[PDB]
Structure to design on (1559 residues):
């Protein structure tokens, strides 16, 4: 068997990690203190859920995670939270000074003092595992500790462990959730830096999830807890293949072979259904063909784009719960007789489907409801290029004036980094246009 | 300042005290006036010595009167204190009264002081010092009291008793009175009677204060500092046989107090002070049986030199010096040996300062023995060169200061024969330091030490000669010490090799780039005084340093090699011999491997890449300017490449060193092309001439901007012999970039550099009448002038501002460089129309609103007008311009200052040909945003309009020119609002008061239509306000224009923006209040009330009725919805 390690950097990163671990403990039945009454092989062994939890002498299931932050404020809530007995004190790494939303600081000044400790902690955590698969890093692009330090750690992990995958779960910022005007400046830098040290990357448009929470979940002003719960649900639906011995996507190296036909192109599109509110617990029922037809909707995707124009390179469907193969075939025939779709004929990948016979789960007392079946579609598409056309555009709006750029140069990096980064963006856009034909 | 030239003012200010002590504003004014008058002599207060007494007596006859109120007495004491901070108390208190009738009047005043009154702290300060200057009286305090048993029931307290109760209370305060309490006890306990009466009591009180107080409680630390200061002062100004009895208990208590470990710098300093005060009480004073406490004192004072602060290190050094002077000659050697341990390898730089201070203190008294010369000196040689970098900061200044202090103290520590052995290592150290030291304090510190040495001893080689030149003021400028005085000192054979070695070792490997450049420029000149030594010993040295792993050392060694090569070439050029006579085959062989050893180690990347490129370019330039023997060798092909790559990666260089990099690369390319690219005398290589030119020309179209900017100057630096038949192509390629294309909109630096390149090329080839592709002829002179004038209208405005102005600058320096050339060759080429256009454009760019471009334009205009050898032909009103700007006045003119430029530029309106352009340029300043520029331009314009307001013809022509300018810039956002504001100002001033006589003037009849067409469908708020003001100023013109302006003013009153609605009414009110003939008195009390009561910022539908009502009063037709 093989396990995995998840490094959570930044505020959004540690929040998403905490939500994911809470959902995992609620699904597997692990109590906050770390007591699994369903587990019988104490001490250690090999199980489906052993790929993300280490067993101790007292039967404690310690999550295989590393929460690092450049500020003690955020980690204080985790240390004093209800799950204080779940995570180990050493796994939580804190810093005395933050990046102040700066990439140069997180990649040079503050990063050079904490990168060594992070690497030592990762090595200590990996010593217990007999076979590691990759490193599921969680960050975003609107901060300086999520881009700078993430790229700095990727640069070292590509040298220490080169034979291990490196999956990411980035968060695409939005102009309504933006906390700084140099938020793009950080994004471009870390994007250009992790291109050769990342196999598959998952981006979350903040505006898309905000609109989903406002419409589906029916919330007046969705907060960061409402968006951290949905990201945890997505992460659980995606990792069920590794946490329940799923047939499709059994390991991390398969994500690059199924959803990444091209090395440079590694930004699939992930959509999930359904999204019922807690109030409408038993109002309507959705079949296996009514939830698979809701994952081909622009408003249901995690990134605002128009896949109907471009063409798809890959496609992987994952059902979770009561789903019969006949229903899956009927839904496929419906999707193949109703919607018009284009596909790359010279791509070395195609359509794949997998099922996981496990009941869904939702945080009790939350805004989500318990459904009987769920679907998650991961499809790489050229329409994601649109998501870039916006980002790069803002960069130009900040390049003609060179505003707030001296702050980044007066910390470590030089000036050619921006030209290299925008030159890497132009090449990516050209490759996207070529693949789209 | 020779004398006090403010006696009457100070006397009047002092006399005004008796009638300003009841004021709060005048009191502070007088205080601030007395402070600023007395602070002028803070650097040399001795000049005020002759005045002290009279001013002191003035302030005394106000505080020594019985009819004096507390407030008046407090101001006098504040003044008294102001005179004691500037002169100081130690010198100003000697003049105070000291008669026996001043003992009770001063103690009684001390007994009516409010300790809790923080505002009157100067009063208490002046009280204590006065009470202390009164304890010198040579009488017993008992004789003064008389009889204490005179008051039955309650006996009076003795004077001495009162003083003991005053000092103990003031020694625990938190204000400045505690310091005055330290000076009082020093003159209270040190007398006979007090010594026998209250010494034990005061000692018990102090030992109790230092037995209960802490360095953590604030008041505890206040109690500690005061007690330590009092004890130190008592042990300093106290008899040694009355004190030695208590020295054993004081040190035993101080040891238990634990001061070294406490976290207070003042407490530790006072503690070391008290420890050194007790240390001398055990020994006998000497004039040049060792108790056990002396060892403990020395062990404490030898640990006060490694302190973290210099204030404690200086005190420890002073204590060690004072102790060594009292101990026998045997213990002095041990003390010196123990102090020398501070200079160990494990000791930090802070320990070195204290060690050097202690060494200087010991040498000042002459305690160091001859045997300690081979060692102590061996350390000083290093302390003078202490300059290290501890991370991001540098250290070594205080070390060098203490080393210079020790050197200055050796002129009296040893005989002339005792120090005769080290006059060759110390004279070289002093001189070397005073010459190359970085800090000015150290340099002058080394200058004073050398002066003292040559004055007292006088055994240094050429002491008087080196002192006369390198004097206190001569070493003020660092640049003068490296390039001038250095050569003068090296003129002698005793200060040549050591200085060069010190420069090549440390200065070349310095961390500062400016210091390295200065050292290289100094070595350039020093090589002249020693060519053989610099060619046989320094060149191998610097050559080995070019292969160092250190970046700064490599750069410094490369610069030194280049400078030495240039100096050797210059020196050899005199005797008419090749440069190879100095450098050997191995030397010229290593000068052909520097660049291939850098490019093969990839030493051109990172932050050091730019520095390495700069160094290699400087080296290549210096080698090409010397005519080195590398022709035909492939090494040349390398150098050239390194230049191109630079012009291809200029955007990689930082924004703070790209211009210098580009200039150095261009200079290196110019030096290389005019040396290694010549086939025959007058001809060039066909292959290189073709390949380089094709590459450069094809590079001009690269979308990158910095590349084009670099290649422009590259083309503008090629020699003349390489463009004998390729000018028709280079000029076209340069002009193709000067054009603004849809894609190259924000590309201004490219054109700015192309213009400068065209200037240089035109200057190099010169004029040859007949040869188009070889030189500037009458066939390719018009195209050049047209390309240069097409870049003068570059008003590109982006998010970066008005960057186009930069291009305009390149058009003023370029167009000049061409004109001045033609006049110096073929003046006939300067056509009349072209010269007139150039002059009018220069006039417009010199009447702008920016201050640095406007100043550049005026200078260019003056240079073009003051050209007489030969005089530039075809100059409109040349004599008029010359009379307006005489050569005598041009020598002092502040063109950058609008005040000293607008009144001189507005006079150009008198000339017809300039009247139009000059006004088009001045409109931007008259309607800009700068307040000072607006004011100055308006004043200068009115000063000229006043001369032609009563002239129907001149005023008419001016109005016609203004309206033509307005029409030419119709719908132009860069000229619409400024010109509208200028028109508004001109109308408000009443310049066109003659046209307002008749009805329907040809001026306003079309100005109103133009303004309407300009403001038709406008959303800008500034434009709307300008239009409203213009329409509210144009009402003065009677006729149909008045009724049309009123209809427009009614139309604007009901605008979409309530702000505009309110502003229109606010301006119409003022317009109606100004011109009374516009509306009769029968409907005048009906308009003001409607304008004041109606809320124009409320509902628009309701304001339409009130606005329509104001149309039935003004008599204006009521508009409708079309
Ligand atoms: N989805 C989501 N986005 C978040 C969350 N917290 C922050 N963000 C987004 O992340 C960006 C801010 O980055 P942070 O993670 O807060 O900052 P950091 O990366 O830790 O870096 P420094 O501030 O430089 O220390 C913005 O785009 C935020 O909207 C979160 O819980 N969820
Ligand atoms: Mg943070």
């Amino acid at each position: 068997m093989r396990e995995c390690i998840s490094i959570h950097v930044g505020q959004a990163g540690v929040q998403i990690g905490n939500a994911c671990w809470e959902l995992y403990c609620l699904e597997h039945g692990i109590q906050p203190d770390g007591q699994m009454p369903s587990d019988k092989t104490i001490g250690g062994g090999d199980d489906s859920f052993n790929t993300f939890f280490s067993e101790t002498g007292a039967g404690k299931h310690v999550p295989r995670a590393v929460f690092v932050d450049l500020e003690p404020t955020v980690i204080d809530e985790v240390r004093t939270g209800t799950y204080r007995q779940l995570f180990h004190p050493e796994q939580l790494i804190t810093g005395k000074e933050d990046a102040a939303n700066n990439y140069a600081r997180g990649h040079y000044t503050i990063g050079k003092e904490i990168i060594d400790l992070v690497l030592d902690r990762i090595r200590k955590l990996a010593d217990q595992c007999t076979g590691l698969q990759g490193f599921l890093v969680f960050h975003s692009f609107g901060g300086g500790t999520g881009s700078g330090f993430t790229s700095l750690l990727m640069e070292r992990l590509s040298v220490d462990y080169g034979k291990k995958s490196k999956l990411e779960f980035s968060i695409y910022p939005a102009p309504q959730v933006s906390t700084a005007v140099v938020e793009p400046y950080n994004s471009i830098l870390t994007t250009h830096t992790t291109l050769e040290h990342s196999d598959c990357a998952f981006m979350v448009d903040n505006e898309a999830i905000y609109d989903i929470c406002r419409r589906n979940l029916d919330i007046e002003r969705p907060t960061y807890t409402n968006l951290n719960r949905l990201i945890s649900q997505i992460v659980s639906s995606i990792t069920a293949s590794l946490r329940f011995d799923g047939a499709l996507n059994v390991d991390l190296t398969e994500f690059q072979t199924n959803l990444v036909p091209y090395p440079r192109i590694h930004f699939p599109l992930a959509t999930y259904a359904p999204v019922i509110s807690a109030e409408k617990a038993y109002h309507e029922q959705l079949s296996v063909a009514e939830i698979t037809n809701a994952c081909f909707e622009p408003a249901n995707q995690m990134v605002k784009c128009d896949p109907r124009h471009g063409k798809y390179m890959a496609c992987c469907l994952l059902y979770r719960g009561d789903v019969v193969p006949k229903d899956v075939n009927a839904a496929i025939a419906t999707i193949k007789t109703k919607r018009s779709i284009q596909f790359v004929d010279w791509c070395p990948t195609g359509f794949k489907v997998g099922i996981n016979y496990q009941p869904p789960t939702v945080v009790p007392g939350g805004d989500l409801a318990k459904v009987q079946r769920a679907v998650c579609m991961l499809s790489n598409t050229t329409a994601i290029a649109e998501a870039w056309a916006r980002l790069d555009h803002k960069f130009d709006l900040m390049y003609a004036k060179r505003a707030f750029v001296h702050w980044y140069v007066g910390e470590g990096m030089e000036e050619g980094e921006f030209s290299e980064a925008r030159e890497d963006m132009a090449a990516l856009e050209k490759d996207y246009e070529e693949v789209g034909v | 300042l020779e004398a006090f030239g403010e006696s009457a003012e100070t006397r009047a200010l002092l006399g005004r005290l008796r009638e300003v002590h009841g004021g709060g504003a005048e009191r502070e004014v007088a205080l601030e006036r007395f402070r600023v008058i007395m602070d002028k002599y803070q650097e040399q207060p001795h000049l005020l010595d002759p005045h002290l007494e009279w001013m002191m007596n003035l302030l005394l006859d106000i505080v020594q009167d019985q009819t004096s109120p507390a407030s008046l007495v407090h101001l006098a004491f504040k003044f008294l204190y102001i005179i004691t901070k500037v002169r100081g108390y130690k010198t100003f208190l000697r003049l105070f009264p000291h008669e026996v009738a001043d003992v009770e009047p001063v103690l009684d005043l001390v007994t009516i002081q409010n300790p809790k009154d923080h505002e009157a702290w100067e009063t208490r300060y002046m009280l204590l010092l006065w009470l202390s200057v009164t304890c010198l009286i040579p009488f017993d305090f008992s004789r003064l009291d008389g009889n204490l048993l005179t008051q039955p029931g309650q006996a009076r307290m003795s004077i001495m008793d009162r003083i003991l109760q005053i000092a103990e209370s003031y020694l625990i305060v938190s204000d400045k009175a505690r310091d005055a309490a330290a000076v009082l006890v020093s003159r209270f306990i040190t007398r006979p009677d007090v010594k026998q009466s209250k010494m034990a009591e005061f000692l018990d009180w102090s030992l109790c204060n230092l037995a209960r107080s802490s360095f953590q409680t604030m008041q505890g630390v206040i109690t500690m500092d005061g007690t330590l200061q009092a004890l130190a002062q008592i042990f300093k100004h106290g008899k040694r046989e009355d004190c030695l009895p208590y020295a054993a208990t004081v040190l035993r208590c101080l040891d238990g107090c634990r001061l070294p470990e406490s976290n207070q710098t003042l407490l530790r300093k006072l503690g070391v002070k008290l420890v050194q005060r007790l240390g001398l009480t055990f020994l006998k004073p000497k004039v040049a049986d060792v108790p056990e406490g002396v060892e403990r004192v020395i062990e404490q004072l030898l640990v006060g030199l490694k302190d973290k602060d210099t204030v404690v290190r200086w005190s420890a050094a002073k204590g060690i010096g004072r102790m060594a002077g009292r101990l026998p000659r045997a213990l002095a050697d041990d003390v010196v040996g123990s102090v020398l341990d501070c200079f160990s390898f494990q000791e930090t730089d802070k320990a070195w300062h204290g060690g050097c201070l202690a060494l200087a203190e010991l040498g000042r008294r002459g305690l160091l023995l001859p045997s300690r010369l081979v060692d102590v000196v061996a350390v000083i040689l290093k302390a003078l060169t202490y300059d290290e970098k501890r991370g991001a900061c540098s250290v070594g200044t205080n070390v060098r200061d203490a080393a210079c202090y020790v050197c200055w103290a050796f002129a009296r520590a040893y005989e002339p024969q005792e120090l005769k052995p080290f006059v060759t290592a110390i004279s070289s150290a002093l001189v070397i330091a005073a010459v190359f030291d970085r800090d000015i304090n150290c340099r002058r510190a080394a200058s004073a030490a050398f002066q003292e040495n040559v004055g007292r001893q006088g055994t240094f080689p050429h002491g008087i000669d080196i002192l006369t030149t390198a004097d206190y003021f001569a070493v003020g400028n660092r640049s003068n010490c490296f390039l001038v005085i250095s050569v003068f000192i090296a003129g002698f054979p005793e200060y040549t090799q050591p200085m060069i070695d010190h420069l090549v070792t440390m200065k070349i490997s310095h961390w500062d780039g400016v210091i390295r450049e200065l050292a290289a420029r100094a070595l350039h000149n020093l090589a002249q005084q020693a060519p053989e030594f610099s060619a046989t010993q320094v060149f191998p040295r610097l050559l080995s340093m070019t292969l160092s792993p250190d970046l700064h050392m490599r750069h410094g060694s490369i610069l030194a090699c280049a400078e030495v090569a240039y100096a050797l070439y210059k020196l050899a050029a005199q005797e008419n011999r090749p440069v190879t006579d100095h450098l050997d085959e191995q030397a010229v062989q290593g000068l052909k491997q520097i660049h291939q050893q850098l490019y093969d180690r990839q030493l051109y990347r990172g932050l050091g890449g730019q520095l390495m490129r700069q160094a290699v370019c400087v080296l290549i330039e210096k080698l090409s300017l010397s005519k080195m023997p590398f022709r035909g060798d492939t090494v040349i092909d390398g150098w050239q490449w390194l230049i191109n790559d630079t012009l291809r990666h200029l955007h990689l260089i930082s924004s703070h060193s790209r211009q210098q990099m580009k200039d150095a690369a261009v200079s290196a390319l110019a030096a290389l092309c005019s040396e290694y690219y010549m086939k025959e005398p007058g001809e060039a290589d066909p292959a290189i001439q073709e390949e380089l030119i094709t590459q450069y020309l094809a590079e001009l179209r690269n979308p990158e901007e910095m590349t084009r900017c670099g290649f422009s100057l590259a083309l503008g630096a090629l020699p003349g012999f390489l463009l004998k038949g390729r000018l028709q192509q280079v000029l076209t390629g340069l002009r193709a970039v000067t054009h603004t294309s849809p894609e190259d909109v924000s590309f201004a630096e490219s054109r700015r550099d192309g213009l400068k390149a065209i200037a240089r090329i035109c200057q190099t080839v010169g004029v040859k009448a007949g040869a188009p592709d070889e030189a500037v002829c009458g066939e390719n002179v018009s195209q050049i002038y047209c390309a240069l004038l097409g870049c003068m209208d570059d008003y590109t405005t982006d998010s970066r501002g008005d960057v186009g102005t930069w291009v305009r600058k390149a058009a003023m320096t370029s167009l000049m460089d061409l004109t001045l050339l033609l006049a110096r060759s073929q003046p006939e080429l300067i056509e009349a129309h072209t010269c007139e256009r150039i002059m009018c454009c220069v006039a417009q760019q010199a009447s702008e609103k920016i201050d640095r471009f406007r100043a550049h334009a005026a200078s260019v205009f003056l240079t073009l007008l003051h050209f007489d050898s030969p005089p530039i032909p075809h100059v409109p009103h040349r004599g008029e311009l010359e009379k307006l700007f005489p050569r005598s006045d041009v020598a002092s003119v502040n063109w950058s200052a609008p005040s000293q430029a607008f009144p001189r530029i507005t006079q150009l309106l008198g000339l017809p040909t300039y009247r139009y352009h000059v006004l088009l340029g001045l409109v931007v300043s008259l309607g800009g945003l700068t307040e000072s520029t607006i004011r100055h331009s308006t004043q200068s314009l009115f000063e000229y309009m006043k001369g032609i307001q009563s002239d129907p013809q001149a005023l008419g022509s001016f109005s016609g020119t203004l309206l033509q300018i307005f029409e030419d810039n119709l719908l132009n956002e860069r000229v619409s609002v400024p010109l509208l504001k200028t028109l508004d100002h001109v109308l408000t001033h009443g310049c066109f008061d003659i046209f307002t006589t008749e009805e329907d003037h040809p001026f306003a009849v079309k100005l109103l239509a133009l303004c309407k067409k300009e403001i038709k469908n406008s959303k800008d708020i500034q434009k709307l306000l300008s239009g409203i003001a213009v329409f509210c100023e144009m009402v003065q013109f009677p006729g149909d224009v008045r009724r049309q302006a009123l209809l427009q003013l009614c139309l604007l009153l009901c605008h979409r923006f309530p702000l505009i609605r309110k502003t229109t009414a606010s301006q119409v009110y003022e317009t109606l209040l100004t011109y009374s003939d516009v509306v009769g008195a029968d409907v005048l009390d009906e308009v003001v009330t409607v304008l004041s009561d109606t809320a124009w910022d409320a509902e628009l539908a309701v304001v339409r009725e009130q606005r329509n009502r104001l149309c039935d009063l003004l008599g204006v037709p009521r508009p409708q919805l079309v």
Observations:
- The interface with chain B takes residues 400-401, 409, 414-416, 419 of chain A (CB under 8 Å).
- Strands of chain A lie at 3-9, 53-55, 61-63, 65-68, 92-93, 132-138, 269-273, 315-321, 351-356, 373-379.
